[PDB]
Amino acid sequence: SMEAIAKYDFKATADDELSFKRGDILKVLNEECDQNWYKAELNGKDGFIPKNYIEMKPHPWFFGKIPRAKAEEMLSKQRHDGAFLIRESESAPGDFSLSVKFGNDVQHFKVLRDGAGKYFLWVVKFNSLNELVDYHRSTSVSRNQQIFLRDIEQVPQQPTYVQALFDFDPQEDGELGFRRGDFIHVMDNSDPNWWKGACHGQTGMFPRNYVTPVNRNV
Amino acid sequence: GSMEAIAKYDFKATADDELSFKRGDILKVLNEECDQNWYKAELNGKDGFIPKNYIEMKPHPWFFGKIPRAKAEEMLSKQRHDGAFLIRESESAPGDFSLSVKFGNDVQHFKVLRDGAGKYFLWVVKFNSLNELVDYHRSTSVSRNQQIFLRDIEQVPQQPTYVQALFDFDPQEDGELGFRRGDFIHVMDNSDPNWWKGACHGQTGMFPRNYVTPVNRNV
Amino acid sequence: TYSNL
């Protein structure tokens, strides 16, 4: 099982299919009832979806080395209060900041990191940035008003690829076959050992240690 | 250890032991990192120190994913030199690849075919991989009307790629990168299967790929 | 800026 992001709006064509909108996050189930379809669930509804309408899920809120200016840019456009992201300073490497939208402005918090490697905003110290974010999904980040962090509306990205290091003939069913050198579209890398991908018109599981990254360029 | 990286910015050397370079240059970076904030590097027969925070992981030079036919044309027609190219995978036929090449003021697209044995080919010559296909056609023309040879496009620095630590890592040697479970690590070199080069908490060094999981692109 | 100086 896996989550993916919708690249297009899909209106269901029969009653056993699942409608969705671009950018929705879909829970896809391991199986594929058709060669071109998955069964999937979304917002309390279940049905089939087409393989070629979904993309690997982007990270929901870690946004790398983007500047404070650009973060205000993308958070201004979000419809919902609490929309947030975390960014590294390209100035001070390794230091992080938290940008959140509330009303017609954008607040910036500095994430602190103590002698033990613990992160914090105020007093409570967290083992990781994930623990900070999830804490503040239900306790406000602001000391004046209730700001609860909410994932921004997500947009599907350009696809991520790997490249085969070795030939891989599939033994088991539902495994993806390829040849050394082949470029593989990656659909799910959430698991440390077995990833879901596509090549030569097929989809399936393959072992990550048979492939090497293809670094982004567009 | 040793790695190629791409310059994010122009850099004029500030001392005679430093190396000047321009944005988009591919630098060879040495395993002998000789200062906290500086790598030793080579570029076109020159060498010197370069600032760590001026360089990015090298992007793939010619495989461009499912870039549409129109965007490929726009990207290529702006290139300065003929034979500039990329490979792309079709958006409507998954698994099928096309080679797009700049022919003067036109862009031309060639459908790469795959036989029953996994060999790729355009006309007569068969290849074991798109890499072999590309390398053949760097020195043999990709057309029989005229003499066109494949040339990498103008390389451009991209937004950084990150991984995330699955476990704590405690370095034993100086050139290794320490981190805690959950830390986001800026990836500088991922071309070796077992040991990757990265940055976090203001340090750079090597770490085992086994300790980390991908952070998927979003910007 | 920063909301926690």
Numbering used by the authors:
A (entry chain B): 0 to 217
B (entry chain A): -1 to 217
C (entry chain C): 23 to 27
Q: What did the authors write?
A:
PEAK pseudokinases regulate cell migration, invasion and proliferation by recruiting key signaling proteins to the cytoskeleton. PEAK proteins are a unique group of pseudokinase (PsK) scaffolds that can self-assemble regulatory networks. In addition to the conserved PsK and SHED domains, all PEAK proteins have an N-terminal intrinsically disordered region (IDR) replete with short linear motifs (SLiMs)—conserved sequence motifs that can that form dynamically regulated docking sites to recruit interactors involved in PEAK signaling. Here, we elucidate the molecular details of key PEAK signaling interactions with the adapter proteins CrkII and Grb2 and the scaffold protein 14-3-3.
The first was a tyrosine/SH2 motif (YSNL; PEAK3Y24/PEAK1Y1107) that is highly conserved in PEAK3 and PEAK1 vertebrate orthologs (and absent in PEAK2 vertebrate orthologs) that matches the known phosphotyrosine consensus motif for the Grb2 SH2 domain (Grb2SH2; consensus motif: pYxNx) and the CrkII SH2 domain (CrkIISH2; consensus motif: pYxx(P/L), proline typically preferred). We confirm that active Src, but not Abl, phosphorylates the conserved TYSNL SH2-motif (PEAK3Y24, PEAK1Y1107), supporting previous cellular studies, and thereby provides a binding site on either PEAK3 or PEAK1 for Grb2SH2 or possibly CrkIISH2. To do this we utilized a synthetic 7-mer pY phospho-peptide encompassing this SH2 motif (TpYSNLGQ; corresponding to PEAK323–29-pY24 and PEAK11106–1112-pY1107), hereafter “SH2-pY peptide”. We have previously shown by isothermal titration calorimetry (ITC) that this SH2-pY peptide binds to both full length Grb2 (Grb2FL, KD 2.6 µM) and CrkII (CrkIIFL, KD 7.8 µM). Using an approach developed for apo-Grb2FL 36, we succeeded in crystallizing a complex of human Grb2FL:PEAK SH2-pY peptide and solved an X-ray structure to a resolution of 2.7 Å. Close crystal packing within the asymmetric unit leaves only this SH2 site (chain B) available for phosphopeptide binding. Whilst no density was apparent for the C-terminal (-GQ) residues of the peptide, we noticed a potential surface groove directly adjacent on Grb2SH2. In contrast, for Grb2, significant binding to PEAKs is only observed following Src phosphorylation (and only for PEAK3FL and PEAK1IDR1), confirming that direct Grb2 recruitment to PEAKs is primarily SH2-mediated and likely occurring via the consensus pY-SH2 motif we have identified and characterised.
